[PDB]
Design a protein around this ligand. Structure first.
Ligand SMILES: [Mn+2]
Ligand SMILES: [Mn+2]
Lengths: 468, 469
């Protein structure tokens, strides 16, 4: 089989994908070809060398290939993983650096954390100038190529905005796309914090990408929510975040639980109303110490760490290339483990589809009735069981609460429709209309000016012309 | 037949209803009984005397009765017209005055035009502290009474919020309510400005209460929107409103037309985004001279005007009580016309249901498939044909645009659900959550304080306790 990783320049992630493949029995065979593709020659090479080296040390028969041709990566593929984050190397070092520059423009026009930060949509680098033109455009191009050169492949969309893109591709191309995100892993924080063994809990989450809720939580044959209530009464007050990313049991999470009736899970906790996000001091009240990860201090700090980690991997690539005796699985155990899968859903999905290794996943697929009061065709993030017969929606029960539907999911669904409309219409009036619905907007003149300046940045030339 | 007017203390409207009934040939009969009910004795009395006086001057066999009892008004009714605007007379002269005071508290806390003014919801006196407790409570009470004591009657809801109340009554009691509003009449304004004969226009509107769109506009066999475009290019810049209410052809309405692809009709124009409403100066840019009717200047002024008109009718009632020879149809023809219906929808509806006089109306009724992409059970404002077999939904064609659905109607529907949840949940957190979605909210502490003060007002004690555990 042929597994293609588009955007392999994202080195650490591409490596953890390869590692997961080489460590998976059913997939660790001679006829498993992994194609690594990216336009960035040096980042691609670093992933390539560290990937081949890793499989050699693991003694895995898997073949690793690299290429700079999208078409070559796609042709005849069985699985295509889209993790690309387009950017202009003349102006920026990465997509996240471009997002950061635009965010700063927004901030000077009075939009704290940028125009792309909206109610229920605070997750950083999720959308770009609202309609995410570069990311949607690329996914659509991949989807259309896949329909002709790889008619049986799954497009595994990991690049953001996952919700908008999966929905756009489905609606406009009919391509075989499935959105992947792993905010569901926040549920293990909850179990731990409450002193529960994960394998003794009967749970389910459902909702929308970065918008999922613990609809079922049961322990020793009963509702386990009373246990959370106890923890809130006794432990919430003294809760402290272990790092900027640590929000699952935060005051914001529990305030949302109090209102909605179920606990928001994972990135859902980041995606709250402005109640929790007005400014950095408000964020520190609701997430404590760091103010979470989506703020002016922590986010640029995170991106810088990413950049450095990547540059270390590139250097390490150089090392192994000159000293073929280097043992990376010994030198750097955390980056190159041998008994530890990443925990990411991508490779289990592949093993499930190809090899009938049945597993429960949480993926962005069309609703088709799983959630009542939502359209069949709406892409949602659902519990599904996957095997070689395909993707089977688990019955969602109990249902999501009324408040979650009317106050959280529906408003998020409408924003998806607004962002999609902003992309397809090529109409600047839609971009304006979105900002007019933005609580931070104080005047129409403000809306016009922030968009004028953002669309006039030199690296946004194509986007500016698109809306002209 | 028994036609009950609940809230007949709203003198001029109650008279308009009586007048239409008396001038309707199939309803002018001695077994047509019009009950006027209201807890306000003076006002009820004035409606009562002027009503009986008018039906005499017309020689109608219609019987007019007055009662301060809700139960008596409802018992055995065939049609119940709820036009009540509940208010505590210990504190205020009317519902409007109460709304005005609360609005000022909100403005003091930084909410221009009050917390009850929200995006797509600028119409003054439409909701009251978001959940409209007094008005929703009353409608529900009437609904349950009606199901028991008037099992076949129609509840014709006129009092606001019509959308919220109609939906709530349908969902929680399943009672036989239909919502009535007259925004659709802005369409004739469009025809007049374009120089078109109202009788030779093929038109349709659809959407939601105070949220309707001119989805079909055809003239002499051709889409007539090109004529609107023509008018915009030639006349818009010099357009001027005739009074604070004149907004149908405003720059606001046209700006919405340009974005959505269809013209907002009637009160829909008042119900825009904050783009047209940030402050009085912004209102004047988009609605010209007066800044429309929903502002700190024109609305109190209109409310005082109403109070003044009501008081003149009460004084006239006295005049007639002490001079049975006065002919009020002569003294004030404008107020007491003959051979001239108001143009309102309520009495034609009654004539259609009762006597099979078939008529096309625009009413709030369950969607039931009329509009694609909306639930069957959602209450919407639809073109319907009415007769003794009931309500027949006209085919809606052309469809409402995508933008109208995703940017206007759906956001409007969600707000109705928010407002409903704010009522039945008895939960103050829901009132808070709504203000948290509000642009003029700058902090949570602001939200807490504005609701605290509003709920602590002496006349809001019932609501205050309702929201307490
Ligand atoms: Mn994610
Ligand atoms: Mn109305």
């Amino acid at each position: 089989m042929k597994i293609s990783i588009v955007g392999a320049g994202s080195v650490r992630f591409a490596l953890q994908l390869v590692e997961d493949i080489a460590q998976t029995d059913e997939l660790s065979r001679e006829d498993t070809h992994i194609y690594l593709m990216d336009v960035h020659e040096r980042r691609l090479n670093a992933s390539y060398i560290l990937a081949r080296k890793y499989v050699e040390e693991l003694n895995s028969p898997v073949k690793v290939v690299k290429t700079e041709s999208l078409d070559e990566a796609i042709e005849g593929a069985d699985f295509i993983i889209n993790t690309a984050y387009p950017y202009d190397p003349r102006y920026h070092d990465s997509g996240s650096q471009r997002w950061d520059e635009v965010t700063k423009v927004g901030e000077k026009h009075g939009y704290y954390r940028g125009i792309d930060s909206q109610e229920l949509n605070m997750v950083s680098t999720y959308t770009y100038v609202l309609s995410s033109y570069p990311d949607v455009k690329l996914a659509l191009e991949i989807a259309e190529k896949m329909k002709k050169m790889a008619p049986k492949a799954y497009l595994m969309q990991t690049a953001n905005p996952v919700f908008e893109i999966t929905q756009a591709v489905r609606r406009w191309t009919g391509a075989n796309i499935i959105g992947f995100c792993h905010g569901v892993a926040g549920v293990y924080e909850v179990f731990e914090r409450l002193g529960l063994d994960p394998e003794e809990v009967d749970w389910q989450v459902a909702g929308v990408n970065h918008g999922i809720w613990l609809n079922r939580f049961r322990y020793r044959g009963k509702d386990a929510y009373p246990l959370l209530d106890e923890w809130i009464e006794k432990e919430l007050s003294k809760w402290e975040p272990k790092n900027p990313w640590d929000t699952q049991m935060s005051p914001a999470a529990m305030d949302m639980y109090r209102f909605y009736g179920m606990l928001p899970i994972g990135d859902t906790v980041r995606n709250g109303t402005w109640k929790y996000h007005y400014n950095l001091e408000t964020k520190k009240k609701w997430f404590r110490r760091f103010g979470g990860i989506d703020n002016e201090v922590e986010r640029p700090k995170f991106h810088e760490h990413l950049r450095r980690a990547r540059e270390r991997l590139i250097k390490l690539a150089e090392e192994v290339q000159e000293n073929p005796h280097l043992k990376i699985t010994e030198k750097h155990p955390e980056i190159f483990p041998k008994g530890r899968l990443s925990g990411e859903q991508h490779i289990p999905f592949i093993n499930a589809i190809a090899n009938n290794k049945r597993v429960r996943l949480f993926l962005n697929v069309e609703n088709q009735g799983a959630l009542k009061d939502f359209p069949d065709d709406l892409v949602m993030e659902l519990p599904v069981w996957v095997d070689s017969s395909g993707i089977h929606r688990e019955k969602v029960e109990p249902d999501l609460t009324h408040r979650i539907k009317i106050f959280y999911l529906w408003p998020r669904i409408l924003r998806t429709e607004w962002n999609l409309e902003a992309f397809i219409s090529r109409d600047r009036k839609v971009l304006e209309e979105i900002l007019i619905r933005d609580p931070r907007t104080k005047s129409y003149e403000q809306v016009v000016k922030v968009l004028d300046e953002i669309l006039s940045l030199p690296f946004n030339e194509e986007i500016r012309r698109y809306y002209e």
